């Protein structure tokens, strides 16, 4: 059998359990999880893993990181007093500055854990997936950053201390704002979650699998869900429990799978390694009398085979949609009361040089949310960093349509200048109009 000559964490244990539920069944899988349970309990007791005050190790670059952050806030407010920027982009600049410094300090905490002490207790608890995210380890070691109002408004002040050093009275009041956010939202939005669940149950309480096949030719086109240049759900994950409606052919011409063929993960990988657009059978395109058939629904995900006649799939669908919103609403208070934001990716030059003028690109100067004038790309073209290397110093950045440029046509680049940045998505920014 397979030997697994590596370190085991939570996701690899989940992979092993999911593999044992392919060729053995439910009971052998539960027996394997039972044996792994008693083995993990025995060696966690034998280890004697413990948490202490000195076990929380703060990286020694936090001082200069905070100093660079306050120097950036100082030059931002110096730019505000001169008169070339306005107040809303100053707000946006100071908020994004403190968020970026918090994320940079979190990455430095993870690197300093990996360098000095790899068998640290807090790092073992967070890295193996036993208990704890990296947000809580960032709040314990690093800085807390910014909190949030109970309505979702953003506060103005930073918290430059962690829980090991101890907060001040002002920082404790600022943290109490976010604690009141978590408590009020836990007490007040679970009604919204449960009302949505009850409405979803009542809209689909009569969707039962009544017949084996409806005999339709209509199909649903499935592509990989992408928001920008990086994927969110791949094609192999999206073809997981479906039946086929059209035959998948390769470039050589051999048929990978026929129609009405159930797809599993192996066949889904074999299909997704060939094409990009697959036509499947869906409940959207089923033709049955106010219900779904056995072939258009596909697999029972709890069991791993095709569904059975008389299954209340509408109740299962409504519970599947209504469970995570209610659970996440009731466990929002685990994160303290901090603000979570998505930092837009920046691609910088490693050393001095200039920039290759992109071929096949027109661009317009568009006023950034932070105040600097930048040129936004219209049609996507390449960018290449022109380094000052006599042998090999060259990096190429292919742009997303909608990125921003802080670089002119052939201008000389300093040591460490800002080069490019793609703006956020619509849902990933989560902004709304105000005054």
């Amino acid at each position: 059998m397979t030997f697994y000559n590596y370190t085991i964490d939570k996701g690899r244990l989940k992979k092993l359990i999911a593999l044992a539920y392919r060729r053995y069944g439910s009971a052998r899988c539960s027996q394997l999880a039972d044996e792994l349970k008693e083995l993990g309990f025995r060696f966690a007791t034998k280890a004697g893993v413990s948490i202490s005050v000195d076990d929380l190790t703060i990286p020694p670059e936090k001082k200069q990181m905070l100093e660079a952050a306050e120097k950036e806030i100082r030059t931002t407010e110096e730019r505000y007093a001169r008169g070339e920027i306005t107040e809303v982009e100053r707000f946006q600049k100071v908020i994004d500055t403190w968020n970026g410094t918090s994320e940079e300090l979190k990455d430095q905490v993870v690197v300093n854990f990996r360098k000095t002490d790899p068998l640290n207790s807090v790092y073992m608890m967070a890295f193996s997936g036993a208990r704890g995210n990296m947000s809580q380890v960032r709040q314990l070691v690093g800085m807390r950053g910014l909190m949030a109002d109970p309505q979702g408004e953003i506060i103005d002040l930073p918290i430059k201390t962690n829980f090991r050093e101890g907060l001040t009275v002002t920082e404790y009041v600022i943290s109490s704002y976010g604690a009141r956010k978590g408590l009020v939202d836990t007490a007040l939005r679970t009604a919204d979650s449960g009302y949505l669940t009850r409405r979803l149950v009542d809209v689909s309480q009569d969707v039962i699998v009544r017949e084996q096949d409806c005999g339709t030719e209509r199909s649903l086109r499935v592509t990989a869900m992408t928001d920008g240049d990086q994927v969110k759900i791949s094609l192999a994950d999206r073809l997981f429990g479906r039946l086929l409606a059209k035959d998948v052919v390769g470039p050589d011409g051999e048929i990978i799978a026929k129609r009405n063929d159930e797809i599993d993960e192996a066949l889904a990988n074999r299909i997704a390694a060939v094409t990009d657009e697959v036509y499947v059978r869906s409940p959207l395109t089923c033709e049955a009398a106010r219900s779904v058939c056995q072939n258009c629904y596909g697999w029972s995900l709890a069991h791993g085979h095709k569904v059975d006649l008389g299954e209340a799939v509408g109740i299962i669908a409504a519970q599947s949609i209504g469970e995570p919103g209610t659970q996440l609403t009731m466990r929002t208070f685990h994160t303290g009361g901090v603000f979570t934001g998505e930092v837009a990716r920046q691609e910088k030059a490693p050393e001095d040089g200039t920039v290759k003028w992109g071929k096949g690109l027109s661009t317009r100067k568009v006023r950034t949310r932070h105040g600097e004038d930048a040129e936004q790309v219209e049609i996507a073209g390449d960018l290449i960093w022109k380094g000052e290397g006599k042998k090999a110093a060259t990096q190429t950045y292919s742009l997303t349509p909608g990125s921003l440029l802080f670089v002119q046509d052939g201008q000389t680049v300093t040591a460490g200048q800002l080069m490019t940045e793609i703006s956020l998505s619509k849902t990933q920014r989560s902004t709304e109009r105000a005054t």
């Binding site: 697994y4 370190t7 792994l36 791993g304």
Partner: protein, 250 residues
């Protein structure tokens, strides 16, 4: 136990009359409330094979009601298995669970074949397993299979398979994270950042090539055979794989 005499009371009353101990419901109820050592053996042989549904509120999805086979514990709390705890979203800091007893035979056959907790591994929302190690078994398996440069006793020694290294660990010869060469002729070996390229090659006599990898050492024949193979691993990884192998193949 005091919860179980109340929930299974007519089944105990039926058994006390079938065994010829009492003759009616009044004597059975009197002997049940008065306390007897006969009642506990009767209840032990009554609850055997009778499934019991457990429920924790809020019931957000299907796995909030699951069926179990009860065993009589002494005390007043209900003992829950630690693997079904993410399915209930239940921790042991104040949660209470309701208990329901099916009465009919169709209702006991449905609790056993459709709702028993050893058949509810996969989620119904995704295809991913709900029943999986968490929060101490994950940390115990991470510590068991990790690398540790400090604990190196008997490092670099050669052992004749898995059972030889397992005997050396229980004898006290090696540490848990010692770098250990293991004679292992199988080729289903998966490592972190898996290597298939040869680093170096030392030629031996009789037409025999000694191929070196990052975590493997393969000695093969000249034309059409492989002779032996050594794998560098820790004893804790050997314990983990022996646990998997004796759990699966049975």
């Amino acid at each position: 136990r005091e919860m179980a005499i109340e929930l299974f009371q007519p089944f105990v009353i039926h058994r006390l009359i079938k065994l010829g101990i009492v003759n009616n419901i009044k004597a059975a109820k009197k002997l049940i409330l008065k306390g007897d050592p006969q009642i506990w053996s009767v209840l032990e042989e009554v609850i055997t094979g009778h499934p019991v549904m457990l429920n924790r509120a809020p019931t957000l999805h299907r796995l909030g009601i699951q069926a179990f086979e009860p065993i009589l514990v002494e005390g007043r709390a209900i003992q829950l298995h630690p693997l079904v705890c993410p399915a209930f979203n239940a921790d042991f800091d104040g949660d209470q669970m309701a208990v329901h007893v099916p009465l009919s035979l169709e209702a006991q056959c449905e609790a056993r074949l459709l709702m028993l907790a050893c058949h509810n591994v996969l989620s119904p929302a995704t295809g991913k397993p709900i029943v999986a190690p968490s929060q101490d078994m994950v940390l115990g398996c991470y510590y068991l299979t990790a690398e540790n440069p400090n604990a190196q006793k008997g490092a670099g020694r050669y052992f004749a398979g898995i059972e030889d290294a397992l005997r050396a660990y229980d004898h006290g010869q090696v540490d848990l994270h010692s770098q250990i060469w293991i004679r292992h002729l199988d080729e289903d070996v998966v490592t972190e950042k898996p290597d298939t390229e040869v680093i170096k090659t030392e030629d031996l006599g009789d037409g025999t090539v000694m191929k070196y990898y990052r975590e493997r050492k393969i000695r093969e024949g000249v034309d059409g055979e492989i002779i032996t193979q050594y794998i560098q691993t820790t004893p804790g990884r050997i314990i983990y794989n022996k646990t998997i192998a004796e759990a699966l193949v049975f």
